[PDB]
Amino acid sequence: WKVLERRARTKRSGSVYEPLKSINLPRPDNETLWDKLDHYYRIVKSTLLLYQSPTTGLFPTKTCGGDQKAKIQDSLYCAAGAWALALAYRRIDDDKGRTHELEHSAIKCMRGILYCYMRQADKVQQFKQDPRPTTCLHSVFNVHTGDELLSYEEYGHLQINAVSLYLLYLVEMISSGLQIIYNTDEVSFIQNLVFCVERVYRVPDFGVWERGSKYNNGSTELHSSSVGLAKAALEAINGFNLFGNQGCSWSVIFVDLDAHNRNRQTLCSLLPRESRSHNTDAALLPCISYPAFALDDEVLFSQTLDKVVRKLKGKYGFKRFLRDGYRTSLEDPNRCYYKPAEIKLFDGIECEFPIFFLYMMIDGVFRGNPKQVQEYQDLLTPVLHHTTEGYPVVPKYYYVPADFVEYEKNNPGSQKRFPSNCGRDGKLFLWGQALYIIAKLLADELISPKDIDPVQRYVPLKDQRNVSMRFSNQGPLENDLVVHVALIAESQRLQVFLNTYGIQTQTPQQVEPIQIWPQQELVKAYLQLGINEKLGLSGRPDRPIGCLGTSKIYRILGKTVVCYPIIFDLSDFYMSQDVFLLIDDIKNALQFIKQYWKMHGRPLFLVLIREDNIRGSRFNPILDMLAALKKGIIGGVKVHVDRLQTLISGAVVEQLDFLRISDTEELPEFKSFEELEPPKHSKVKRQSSTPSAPELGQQPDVNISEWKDKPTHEILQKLNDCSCLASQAILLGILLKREGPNFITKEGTVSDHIERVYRRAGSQKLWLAVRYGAAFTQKFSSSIAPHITTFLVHGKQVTLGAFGHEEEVISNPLSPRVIQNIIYYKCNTHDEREAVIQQELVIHIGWIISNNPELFSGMLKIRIGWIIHAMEYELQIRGGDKPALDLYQLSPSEVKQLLLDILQPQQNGRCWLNRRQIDGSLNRTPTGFYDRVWQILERTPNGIIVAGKHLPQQPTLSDMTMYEMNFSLLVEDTLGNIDQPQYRQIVVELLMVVSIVLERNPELEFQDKVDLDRLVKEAFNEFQKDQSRLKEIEKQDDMTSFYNTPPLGKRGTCSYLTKAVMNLLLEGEVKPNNDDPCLIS
Amino acid sequence: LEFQDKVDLDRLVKEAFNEFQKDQSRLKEIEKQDDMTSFYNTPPLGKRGTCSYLTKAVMNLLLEGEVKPNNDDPCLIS
Amino acid sequence: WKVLERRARTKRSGSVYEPLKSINLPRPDNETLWDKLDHYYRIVKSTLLLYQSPTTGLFPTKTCGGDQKAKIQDSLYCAAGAWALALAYRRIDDDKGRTHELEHSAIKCMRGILYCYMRQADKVQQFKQDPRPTTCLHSVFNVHT
Ligand SMILES: Nc1ncnc2c1ncn2[C@@H]1O[C@H](COP(=O)(O)OP(=O)(O)OP(=O)(O)O)[C@@H](O)[C@H]1O
């Protein structure tokens, strides 16, 4: 180092003036880099590269016995290790022809994987349309011929993490510089593979462990690791060029932002756990380590790492997950599936995998924590095995001997475990060996972290500034996005009308170089992208484009393209006839764009103004919204308004060159948006608002319970001579139900008449009539399915059905056709207006949870019918002495407003009965109440019975944990049998009191099963006796006076509840705790 | 829970004795007898010990009075 | 930081399963980045950007006495300061039209230096052939013309 190097003080001491360089610096232990690299090359060639089939380049999973199966993940890891060794050898000019061999080792493995995948193209086509385990790509192929080996009935073959890892590794090696993909057919295949990958967030997967779940009963559940790997692969493949340096504009892969956003939303909420049944697992390590680096949070990552280290760490290695029976002593090697209560026997004897020590060392090296790397190196050193030549071997796992299982269970970690079959000479673990080679290369500073991560998957805390779709320029802790807003008016007349009121707008005739397209044209253009007639490929499926996809600017066939959001188009529903709903939707879209924008450059937003919604009393809200837009801030979001030509100038454009490459003889025509010519008959020059009052009021005089058995001629005459719109619509509904839609009426066919009545009622703003028409037409909105899938993404279940009747649970995402069938074929016994109100409610709640998820904290499942019952009760209570008006005529604006008023966290004021009814209908529970239920369940034998349903104690404890979401679902299902919301709240209050008493008094225990109904009845009796003694009131039935009592206070409900609980508890045995020093008590 | 007014031990002892006498009469069909010769023989822990009657009586007295919720504890609706 | 951020142990102590994010982390001394950047902008405007000739954009070496000389290195360093301040301001979306002004200031200083150098092309030609102090580019130009 400095001062020591010079040592040139020939005479005493003095200042020296001469170059020192660095070659003359003292050198460490005398060993050239060539010797170390040759040693690594030897231990690689003799152990890892020795097992590779030249025909396909696929590494076999077994090194003995002539096994033909070969996994994909192991081959990918071996290729990664070979590529790392090639990068290590790259540092030497005279390589003696060794870098090329390892580089093509990686190349050949990747090409074999690609060939095996491309042998199944019909499987890709089927998975694109209906992704199911029966129609998924195989994960195990023959090691000699590249042929399928195991059928769907014995392996499942549903593994997406392998595909995601393959794509990410391909991106990494191509970015580092390689030649893997040759022609355009491979480009199309990879593009359609990415298309299949886009829809990971809905389909359950078997997971990396190929078991499916802890129970191992052939069940598929969503896994955090798979979602994270898919998100990382999508991030890497966005805008990436597969041809390397020698590439053009027609070799790029385009990724939809909506799928990435959905994956991120589905990941960032389930990440603290692994799945519904797995609280923690060791498979989360690759998701947040060197494979993926898909967690850009640095707090959730720390929490997950701490949880994993606290739970699954062992001295031999890391267990896969708690209660695992993989190759354990107690496992029975003749049955593929497990049994209920069997997994309890696998506690304390779980196997440990040493490869997670290598994973930890790699993560520590990447983060820059030498102490952790050294500690894990010392921990991993004694568990290594050497061959005859001395080459280290990493055992696959360690298993307890069958004789010592009892001793291990009594005191974990005391006994000595035995190495697996692949932990000595003769059998080897290629994945573990490649991991060890990579870890040793990285820990010895032979590989820089940048060399193995060209795409910069991992960034430090000081570099989370400018990454596409990962961080915004402001940073990861700030969001003040500014949205560019351009106003578009249809005709010059509308532009003049807006300009006369201080609003400046541009028309399509004034932006001639700029073409405005709807979403359909963009969808059609993206459909033509993935066309490959040689293999058979349909390209991108016909799906709508979200707000994120419509915020860019595209250049198609040399013409710039701008697309307005899907909010501005209306197809069949009457929700677009309210300007307030449009304003709410545009505000929600602006907030969603601001919250979930991570691209480069300000997003472009187009506003469409239609003459149909500036007419009448609705002109003022539109003018106010336009003034707010012009001011600069709308709904807490800052916006900028300027000319479109200036905005598009100097901005980043999107290139769609695949259209030119298409071999179609005739180029498809796209209809851009056009200026609307003015009428030559009426010549309406955008007149004033003119409120006026050409409306009347009358209630319908006919109900379905009366005009049912009346004859055809009389009902036809009544329809002819009547004028009420709602009464009319009722008569046409009856006519369609009985006489058929094709019946010929006085004014034409029935259906035409009902459509015309719906149209005029919507024009005249008669909500009852339009809702009746929509109910009788069985009309459907395409926005329900995205709302339902967003509901299911957030981990919240939805149930449709009338209050106090049959309901259906949507466990998993499903096609819109089945949703329509369920909604319109399960409410036949009730009025069809329930379906329409359910659609409105589900859309509103979906939008609210998309924008404000905090409003729904504490509730798991959403019941539309119970919320409607609470809606009606709230309308009644605001009615007071005067009866409530109606629920089906208050209009969607007031429906949403008073629904928001219902959704308030607290409603102090009116008596506790109303609050109890509202809370019970909304299905709101205290935080952690399910943990209290679990504690009671452990401390209460024989289970708990309520509302007829009985919940057992043995299988729940033996199969299931404290924090498992399965317990949440089971408790919700058990407690949902109660029909009265107030009774449900009484039950939950009793459960909370029981939990508090049990925790505060550990000595007491329940002798037998507890029946909550008996305790409720005893509380009734005690409260009635108290009231009769206090006021001399004769005993009365029904809960009508018990709910009104405040829960806490003087003679509250809680007091009677705890009195009954203690009376029951003291009836049983009292076991004294010897630990407590309280004597003679 | 707090005591509303002054406590008197004789009343609690009498109530515990009456509860024990009623329990014995129900269990073994034994007529009520004066003096606590049988009450003292009961062990102070286990099945229907004297501790159970004493804690039942004191809890019944406590729940008669007002219950003040502590805002420090995060337990809600309790 | 970690462990301190959660503070969600409502009942004694136990493992929690909920997102924590980083926005809820404790914040240092409360001061918006806009306020500090505005303070820096005022300091720059009142001291450095005040003395700049509109004709050429060359910063004068003297702030008083009506001196006409202007060095090149000082102007380059002033442009460096303006560019650095603009880069610092670039982190905000709503700059109120301030980043563009400093980006200009840098552009104008560079263009003034370039114009002053371009005014002497025969000097460059002579420097190419026989580099001598008598045939070298000038280093001090007029601040106004
Ligand atoms: N009316 C709408 N309002 C808002 N976003 C919409 C609307 N219609 C479609 N989208 C967006 O378009 C995409 C919807 O995709 P698509 O309709 O193909 O099905 P999905 O969301 O994958 O699920 P599902 O199986 O329920 O249809 C999502 O980005 C959704 O946000």
From Swiss-Prot, chain A:
Write down which residues bear the modification named Phosphoserine: 15, 689
Q: Which disease is it linked to?
A: Glycogen storage disease 9B: A metabolic disorder characterized by hepatomegaly, only slightly elevated transaminases and plasma lipids, clinical improvement with increasing age, and remarkably no clinical muscle involvement. Biochemical observations suggest that this mild phenotype is caused by an incomplete holoenzyme that lacks the beta subunit, but that may possess residual activity.
Keywords per UniProt: Acetylation, Calmodulin-binding, Carbohydrate metabolism, Cell membrane, Disease variant, Glycogen metabolism, Glycogen storage disease, Lipoprotein, Membrane, Phosphoprotein, Prenylation
What exactly does this protein do? Phosphorylase b kinase catalyzes the phosphorylation of serine in certain substrates, including troponin I. The beta chain acts as a regulatory unit and modulates the activity of the holoenzyme in response to phosphorylation.
Enumerate the residue ranges of region (Disordered): 677-704
Q: How is its activity regulated?
A: By phosphorylation of various serine residues.
UniProt PTM comment = Ser-689 is probably phosphorylated by PKA.
Query: Which residues belong to the signal peptide in this entry?
Result: none
Keyword Lipoprotein applies: yes
Q: List, alphabetically, the SUPFAM superfamilies matched.
A: Six-hairpin glycosidases
Q: Where is the lipid attached (S-farnesyl cysteine)?
A: 1078
Q: Name one GO biological process term.
A: glycogen metabolic process
What's one GO-annotated cellular component?
cytosol
Query: What are this entry's molecular-function GO terms?
Result: calmodulin binding
Pfam families found in the cross-reference section:
Glyco_hydro_15, KPBB_C
Q: Its principal location?
A: membrane
Tell where it localizes: Cell membrane
Protein name per its UniProtKB record? Phosphorylase b kinase regulatory subunit beta
Biochemical pathway: Glycan biosynthesis; glycogen metabolism
Q: Where is this region: Calmodulin-binding?
A: 1-17, 756-783, 908-939
Gene field? PHKB
Q: How does it sit in the membrane?
A: Lipid-anchor
Provide the taxonomic classification. Answer: Eukaryota, Metazoa, Chordata, Craniata, Vertebrata
Family per similarity comment: Belongs to the phosphorylase b kinase regulatory chain family.
UniProtKB/Swiss-Prot annotation, chain B:
Its annotated compartments are: Cell membrane
Lipidated residues (S-farnesyl cysteine): 75
PTM note says: Although the final Cys may be farnesylated, the terminal tripeptide is probably not removed, and the C-terminus is not methylated.
Q: Which residues form the signal peptide?
A: none
Q: Which family does it belong to?
A: Belongs to the phosphorylase b kinase regulatory chain family.
Q: What disease is recorded for this protein?
A: Glycogen storage disease 9B: A metabolic disorder characterized by hepatomegaly, only slightly elevated transaminases and plasma lipids, clinical improvement with increasing age, and remarkably no clinical muscle involvement. Biochemical observations suggest that this mild phenotype is caused by an incomplete holoenzyme that lacks the beta subunit, but that may possess residual activity.
Subunit structure, per the record?
Hexadecamer of 4 heterotetramers, each composed of alpha, beta, gamma, and delta subunits. Alpha (PHKA1 or PHKA2) and beta (PHKB) are regulatory subunits, gamma (PHKG1 or PHKG2) is the catalytic subunit, and delta is calmodulin.
**What this chain does, per the record?**
Phosphorylase b kinase catalyzes the phosphorylation of serine in certain substrates, including troponin I. The beta chain acts as a regulatory unit and modulates the activity of the holoenzyme in response to phosphorylation.
The identity of this protein, by name, is Phosphorylase b kinase regulatory subunit beta
According to its UniProt entry, this protein's organism is Homo sapiens
From the broadest rank down, the organism's phylogenetic lineage runs: Eukaryota, Metazoa, Chordata, Craniata, Vertebrata
UniProt gene name: PHKB
Counting on the full-length protein, the chain here runs from 1016 to 1093 of 1093
